[PDB]
Amino acid sequence: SPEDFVYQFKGMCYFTNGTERVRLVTRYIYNREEYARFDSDVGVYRAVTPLGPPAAEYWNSQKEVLERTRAELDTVCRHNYQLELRTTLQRRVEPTVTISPSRTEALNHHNLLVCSVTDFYPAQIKVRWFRNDQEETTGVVSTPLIRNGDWTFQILVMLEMTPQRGDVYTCHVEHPSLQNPIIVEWRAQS
Amino acid sequence: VADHVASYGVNLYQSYGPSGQYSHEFDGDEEFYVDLERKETVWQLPLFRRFRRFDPQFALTNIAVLKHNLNIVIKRSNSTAATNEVPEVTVFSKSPVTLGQPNTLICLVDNIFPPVVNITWLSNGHSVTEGVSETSFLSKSDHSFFKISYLTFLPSADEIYDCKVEHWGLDEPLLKHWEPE
């Protein structure tokens, strides 16, 4: 195994409530240790480890660099946000919903219905299980939100149940991309 | 606890190669990366190529300063080399699996470091190159990375898969099996 020397620089913007609260943080990393950084909440470069004093000192001693950095909260963060607003933040991809039985392998002496909500964006989402006219609160288990990497999310919600003739199950999905919720139904025994 | 997190500058540069990466991220996804050799910005969505533009030259200039910085910090740290991490591999389908219906397998390689990895696919024990694809290295707050590989495929009862991951942090190639149960 060869030796590797890795360097990382991250220019990060943190947004809360539109652009009401904006925080800028630049991070300098050697391998995996952030040795120096700049956080807009404080306003000056900081040596985070004993590996950064030569850096923080160098940059803090230069007037235009401190000012220019401080200004990046606007020229970079607030600036790009405007581009993010009419693109990313308004992107809407409806989820396709599917219901299918557990299969086998035993779901714990108790059958399982799997409601898979796929290919949606943004992340915000609400999934609910119904048995006839009542909502299922217990016996419901969900996988964490899953990131496909292609700008789409996926999530799986199983419901513990016992197939009984007559009973009807539905999966209700609420997402910012649809005015009406998506409702899929599965009928036990048929 | 922020409503949105963005990295308008995920810059990487390694002595191994040497190699580097320049990309932008928003809420954990890659907006684009700059092909360093071709000096061309590669956006990740049609929506982005249509409404936004980023000068590739800026990526090259930053990366050049990172090289300048790395050499200096290698000396300052008495040449402290990076530690290899054990990759976590997870394979899963993009869409519910229905035989005969085109789908895509997703192979997530988490906790990667350093950012040097070999992710390939196997179809019934044979190497598969067609329909294979992958994201760039996505950042992690802990400073490691994660990369996701794709394999478009036709669900078949007579076909199974394995995501092959090669990383110096592994005693030997890792294989995560997967098949339409």
């Binding site: 630049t26 220019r68 970079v76 | 930053n62 990172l66 300048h68 910085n69 910090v73």
Partner: peptide
Amino acid sequence: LVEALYLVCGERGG
């Protein structure tokens, strides 16, 4: 209208 970026500061070379 075009994307902006942070400029990584350069360590002092001796």
